[model samples]
Target: QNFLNDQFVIDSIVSAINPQKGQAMVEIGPGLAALTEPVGERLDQLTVIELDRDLAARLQTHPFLGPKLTIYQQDAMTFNFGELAEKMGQPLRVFGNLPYNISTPLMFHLFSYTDAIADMHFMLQKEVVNRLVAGPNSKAYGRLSVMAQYYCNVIPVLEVPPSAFTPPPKVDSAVVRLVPHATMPHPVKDVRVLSRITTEAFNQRRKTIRNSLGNLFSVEVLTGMGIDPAMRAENISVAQYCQMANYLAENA
Candidate 1:
């Protein structure tokens, strides 16, 4: 109950996108209309996706939000943003206070439809937010950081204390904004190869590229690329990964 009243999360979502009237907006988990009301006020139409049946029923009747809000009883992880884009004739501003259990996978799922999203604001577990905004060579840097940073410009907005929630999840929370690139900053010729290389490199993160990817690339290959065979995945940049993937696709 107390968690439902903490409107700071809602305020942060609104501030992040600053949607104007007539624009399309979607709320991923509009639990009890905390965000639905304020966001609905600013947008000509607002769509909310929720899996909880009882919560969906309650949100449908929100007085301040009912008319302008469209509640979809669906898992956001599987929602089709492309269909929404086709119907609206424009892209959407997506925001959410996501359930921690599904946050990372949901972000990956949403990234597929980034072409239809103007931007995204999410309230997520602080540790996950740290990973999203992590940089090269940091202990926190890994697959999530690399993949997320490759696709979007991520910014950490605000940190919220545990007291902000009712049961108060044992950890802190944070708000993050991810604006998908109109064009990938460093586009790889083959993203599939890039994904494989990244997955393989990080699979044995403690080991150097020679030890980890030895079966895939020879010492000569690494030397030709100017990549030290002794360096681990953490030591490489996104551009380097893109280069390595292209090299592997061409030569392997």
Candidate 2:
């Protein structure tokens, strides 16, 4: 019956990962300073991104914390952490209880600054967690799963029931940790081509590659690559996708 208690969330995050003293730490949506207070105690500095102007203003004067926390009244989706990289010479460890509405897009935006981010932990809608951790051929597999896995090593940490939040959400929630790979496990030759190929393939998922990717690749091309023209996108491995992507990029 904890129901939307911010304090519990903060405690859970801190217990999950003990920060190395002096490392840069950032909390996305630090509403009411729940996690901020405990996280602040562990590190010399902390940055928080919050969207609500009123909440940011009130957080500025919280008696338990003030100077140690730097508050940014900004959107997490567009906030650039490169400034922290410039100052600290390293990426930050980011944590958040992300708004379900913008979770997917926000994560896509973060990928741009992956170099400046060490790892990220967030509480997100449970279904989104499933997609993030899903494999290539699973029901949950698609663009989100493929693109996200392409960038980060995703780990589902815990599952919390509806009763855990204050104004409890209608659905369950889960904590997912994304550790951006220093380098992709399988680097594609042309990212744009890969994206285009994957997008087209999944867009027409029910169709075979010969039909779905016909414009970019011919039936002969599929046969030459040893990929059956009758196969669906989900049936293809990440490596095969990369091969097709590379082949298309080179032959196109």
Candidate 3:
């Protein structure tokens, strides 16, 4: 619920976005236009997806921002980003200071549109950033790490303290950059299989794969793939998960 009022933080994110004139970029939640105004200055036109009706109207009619800003008064979660990309005839660069509650699901939604997107930069809760960039063998690692790494390279850009926000959140914040791979780094035959595998594995993170993934993959199958049946969900690497999914897809 806190607003980003720190100029340094805003400038940091804007510079990280590197918005160019005529670039097809969309901001998810341009609350108060703190970020939108500056990024707009660098671009010939800016498109924003704002959920708030009043805010969307304000942004649409803003004396200076109005002409240059294309406002979509719609929920970002359900917005058809592909339509925008198609209209622009190019992949879109997306950046936003995302709301904490919907951050994870929202990101999962965005991941489905990676082919239409160039890169994404976001200001998210620090904990979420850790999970996004986490590798195997850490408590922070799980489904998000595996899935995010599968589609893009995740990078931690900057850490913002609680004071950077107007109301100052109890938890710290961070900016992360996600660049979608032009060529699939670890391509799986069926992404649905990978997602199902990750979901089942992480749903019972306390259990070993022998139990969590027992229904889908046999212990013998896991061993054949060089994965330890006794290994917990967090120990499996993203590449390994892709491998497992490919195996499953081939067998099916």
Could you estimate the TM-score for every candidate?
A: 0.93, 0.90, 0.95
User: What is the Cα-based TM-score of model 3?
Assistant: 0.95
Best by TM-score: 3
* TM-score attained by model 1: 0.93
Tens-digit lDDT string for candidate 1 (158-214): 888878777687888988999899888877777778778888988999999898888
**Which residue pairs overlap in candidate 2's backbone?**
3-165, 3-166, 4-165, 4-166
Worst 10 residues of 1 by lDDT: 1-10
Q: Put down candidate 3 lDDT per residue, 1-252, tens digits, no spaces.
A: 578899988888888888998779899999889999999988788899988887788887777889998888888888888889998889999999898987888787888997998999999999989999999999999898999999999999999999999889999999999988899989988788999999999999999999999998998899999999999999999999999899888897
The per-model lDDT (C-alpha) reads 0.82, 0.80, 0.90
Segments of candidate 3 deviating more than 4 angstroms: none
